[PDB]
Design a protein around this nucleic acid. Structure first.
Lengths: 152, 56, 159, 68, 118
RNA sequence: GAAAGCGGCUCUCUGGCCUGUAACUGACACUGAGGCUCGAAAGCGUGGGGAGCAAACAGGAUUAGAUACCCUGGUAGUCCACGCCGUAAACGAUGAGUGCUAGAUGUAGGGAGCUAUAAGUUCUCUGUAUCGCAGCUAACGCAAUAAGCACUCCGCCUGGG
C-alpha cells in the first residue's frame, strides 16, 4: 500500500537475553500458545545445556549466521522479461526469514517431541552444517544470474 | 587527425572523453536509426518536424 | 471438459439444442486448456416470447466470465450468445496469450516594458526590491536605484 | 561571439577552396562539416561556400573521413 | 614444447555487438593468441550482454594475456552495445596499462540497404 | 521543376524565373473541349550486370493453428542500356488566369538606399511557413502562397449499394 505503516515490537529476553527468543516464540508459537512456545525455546537452550552447556548465543548466533543470507530475490519485468533483480534486506527481516527456516526444519521433522526434532535442528544447528547453509546458498548461487540490475 | 587520447588521460578521464565527445560524435543516432532500411517517404518523415522540433 | 451445470430455470430441458450448447462449448474445448467449470442458467417466459434469457458462467482455472444475454428465440440466444462466447475468446486471445504486450537563476530581467530611472524609485517600490530591475527609458540603456544605508534614494549604477 | 559564416571575416568571395584550414575551419573534429545551426548559417550563402567545400573536402587536400 | 612469444604492446580488439562481445588481445598488426568472447563463456540468453559478464569477458583473456606476458595495452574497441561500458572500465582496470582506447566503428554513407522494417 | 520528382564529385548543351528596366513591338492577352506530350510505383520485352536487400517458397518459434509478425535463409524483382502500360492519398481529397486588401510573422536572391574609422538597419519581388483583421463555413478551419470579395477558360457533382 502507500505508506510505512508501523510495525509492532515484542520484548527481548531477560532469561537468555535475545529478542529472537521471543521472536522464536513468534514463529514456534501457534494458536497463541506462548507458554508452550517458551517451553520449547527454554527447552532448546536446555538442548544447548546438555550438549555444550555454553551460552545460548553460540549455537543460536552461529545458527543466525547459517540462516541469515546475504541476498534475496525479487520479480522485476520489462513486459514479461522477468529479470530476477535482487536485494539485500536488513537483519530484522533476514533474521525473520531465518526464523522461518528454523521453524521450517525445526518443525517439519517426524521425530518424537517438538524438542526432539527441534533437538535435531537446534542440535544440528550446533552441528552448523547441511540444511541451513544450503538453505541460503540456494539463493546465493543465483546471484550471478541476478547480475542484471535495470539494464534491458 | 585522430589523437585518440585526451591530454594525459586517465581511465575514467578517457571514459569521460569518449562518453562526452563520442556522445557528441553523432556516431550512434544514424546507426540505431540504421538498424533497418526504410521507405524514402519515411526518410522524409525523418526529414520532418523531428529536426524542426530540435531547432524550433 | 471438467464439469457443467446445465439449468433450464423456467422451462424443462431438452438435449438437442442443449447438445448444440454442448458442441459450441465443444468449441470452447477447441479454445480450452482446462475447462474447469461452466453453468447453463436460462430463462424464458410467457406472452409469445417477449424475451429469451440464457446464461452460462465460465469459471476457467484463471478467468471467470458469465453470459446472461438475450434474443427473441431461445434457439437464437443459444446461437448468438454462444457465438458471443466465441467472439469473447476472440477478445480473450491477447487477454490470455499476450502476457507480453511488446543559486541565482541564470535568466534575464523578468519584467517586460522599460521604465525610466526616476521610475526606478517606484520600481524598487513596485515589487519590493531594494534595487529596481528596469531597462532605463530616460538613460540610454539600463539603470537601477538601490537603497543607500544612510536612508536616501540610492542608485546601484554603473552610470 | 558573432562568429557566423566567417564571410564578413574573409570578406569577400575568396576562394572558397584554395585555403587549407582558413576556410576549412568549417570542418568538424571528425572530418565532417560544422553545423549550419551551431554555426547558424545564412542558407544559400552557406551553399555558396559548401558548393565548393564538397569539392574541397574530397579533392585530396583534406581528410574527408576522420574522428576525434 | 610449443612456440611461444613475449610481446608487450598487444592490440586489444574488442567488438561489442548489440548482442555479444568478443574480447581479443592481438599482435603488432596483428594476430591474437590470448583472446575470447562473452559467448565463449556460456552466457547465452538474456545474459549475452550483461556488462559485468562483459567485465569478466574483458577479464579472462585479459589475464590470459600474461601467458604471452604483456602488461601495456593497445586497446581497440569497435561497435556499441548493451554491455560495452563495464567492459570498457573493466579492461581499463584489468591489471593493464590503459592509454589508448581506440574507437574503430566503421561508417557507411547511405550504403547497402539494411534488412527491412523490423 | 506544371507536377511526377530532383543531393559524392567534374565537364557537355540545356530550359525556366525574379530583380532592375520603356530600349522596343503596340494588346501580340488569358486561356482551353478536341488532339498532343510528359508522367509515380510495380510489372511486362530484349540484352547485361549481378554486392546488399527482399516477392515465391522452405526451415525454426508461435498457438488450437501459422500459409502471418520474429529468426535463418532464399527465387522473381530492385541496378544498367533499351520499348510499354497510363493507372497512385495525383494530396493539400483545395483547377487555370488576373484584381483587391489588417497585421505578428520565416527565408532566398537581387534591386535600392543603409550604419560607418571595420558594425548594422529600412524599402522593394517572386518563394515557402505559423498565428490571426475583415470576410468566412454544418462545423473543423482558411485568410496573402484566402475555404473573403469579382470576372474569362475549362472541368466534375446529383441518395445509397
Amino acid at each position: 500500500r502507500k505508506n510505512r505503516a508501523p510495525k509492532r515490537e515484542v520484548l527481548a529476553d531477560p532469561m537468555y537475553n535475545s529478542i529472537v527468543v521471543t521472536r522464536l516464540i513468534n514463529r514456534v508459537m501457534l494458536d497463541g500458545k506462548r507458554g508452550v512456545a517458551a517451553q520449547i525455546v527454554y527447552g532448546a537452550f536446555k538442548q544447548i545445556e546438555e550438549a555444550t552447556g555454553n551460552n545460548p548465543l553460540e549455537v543460536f548466533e552461529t545458527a543466525m549466521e547459517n540462516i541469515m543470507p546475504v541476498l534475496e530475490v525479487r520479480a522485476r519485468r520489462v513486459g514479461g522479461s522477468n529479470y530476477q533483480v535482487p536485494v539485500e534486506v536488513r537483519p530484522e527481516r533476514r533474521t525473520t526469514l531465518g526464523l522461518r527456516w528454523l521453524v521450517t526444519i525445526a518443525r517439519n521433522r517426524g521425530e518424537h517431541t517438538m524438542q526432539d526434532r527441534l533437538a535435531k535442528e537446534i542440535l544440528d544447528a550446533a552441528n552448523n552444517t547441511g540444511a541451513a547453509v544450503k538453505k541460503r546458498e540456494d539463493t546465493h548461487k543465483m546471484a550471478e544470474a541476478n547480475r542484471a540490475f535495470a539494464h534491458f | 587527425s585522430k589523437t585518440l587520447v585526451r591530454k594525459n588521460e586517465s581511465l575514467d578521464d578517457a571514459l569521460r572523453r569518449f562518453k562526452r565527445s563520442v556522445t557528441k560524435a553523432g556516431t550512434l543516432q544514424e546507426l540505431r536509426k540504421r538498424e533497418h532500411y526504410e521507405k524514402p517517404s519515411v526518410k522524409r518523415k525523418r526529414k520532418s518536424e523531428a529536426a524542426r522540433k530540435r531547432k524550433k | 471438459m471438467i464439469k457443467f451445470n446445465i439449468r433450464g430455470e423456467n422451462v424443462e430441458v431438452t438435449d438437442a439444442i442443449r447438445a448444440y450448447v454442448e458442441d459450441k462449448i465443444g468449441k470452447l474445448d477447441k479454445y480450452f486448456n482446462d475447462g474447469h467449470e461452466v453453468t447453463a442458467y436460462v430463462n424464458l417466459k410467457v406472452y409469445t416470447e417477449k424475451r429469451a434469457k440464457v446464461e452460462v458462467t465460465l469459471p476457467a482455472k484463471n478467468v471467470t466470465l458469465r453470459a446472461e444475454d438475450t434474443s427473441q428465440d431461445m434457439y437464437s440466444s443459444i446461437d448468438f450468445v454462444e457465438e458471443k462466447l466465441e467472439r469473447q475468446i476472440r477478445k480473450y486471445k491477447t487477454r490470455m496469450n499476450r502476457k507480453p504486450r511488446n543559486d541565482i537563476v541564470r535568466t534575464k530581467h523578468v519584467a517586460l516594458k522599460p521604465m525610466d530611472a526616476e521610475e526606478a524609485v517606484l520600481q524598487m517600490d513596485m515589487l519590493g526590491h531594494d534595487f529596481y530591475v528596469f531597462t532605463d527609458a530616460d538613460s540610454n540603456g539600463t539603470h537601477v536605484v538601490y537603497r543607500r544605508t544612510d536612508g536616501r534614494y540610492g542608485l546601484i549604477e554603473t552610470e | 561571439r558573432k562568429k557566423v559564416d566567417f564571410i564578413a571575416a574573409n570578406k569577400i568571395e575568396v576562394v572558397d577552396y584554395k585555403d587549407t584550414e582558413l576556410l576549412k575551419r568549417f570542418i568538424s573534429e571528425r572530418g565532417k562539416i560544422l553545423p549550419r545551426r551551431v554555426t547558424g548559417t545564412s542558407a544559400k550563402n552557406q551553399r555558396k561556400v559548401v558548393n565548393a567545400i564538397k569539392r574541397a573536402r574530397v579533392m585530396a587536400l583534406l581528410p574527408f573521413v576522420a574522428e576525434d | 614444447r610449443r612456440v611461444k612469444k613475449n610481446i608487450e604492446s598487444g592490440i586489444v580488439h574488442i567488438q561489442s555487438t548489440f548482442n555479444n562481445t568478443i574480447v581479443m588481445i592481438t599482435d603488432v598488426h596483428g594476430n591474437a593468441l590470448a583472446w575470447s568472447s562473452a559467448g565463449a563463456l556460456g552466457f547465452k540468453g538474456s545474459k549475452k550482454s550483461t556488462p559485468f559478464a562483459a567485465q569478466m569477458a574483458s577479464e579472462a583473456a585479459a589475464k590470459a594475456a600474461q601467458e604471452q606476458g604483456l602488461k601495456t595495452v593497445s586497446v581497440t574497441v569497435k561497435g556499441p552495445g548493451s554491455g560495452r561500458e563495464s567492459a570498457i572500465r573493466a579492461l581499463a582496470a584489468a591489471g593493464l596499462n590503459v592509454t589508448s582506447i581506440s574507437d574503430v566503428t566503421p561508417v557507411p554513407h547511405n550504403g547497402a540497404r539494411p534488412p527491412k522494417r523490423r
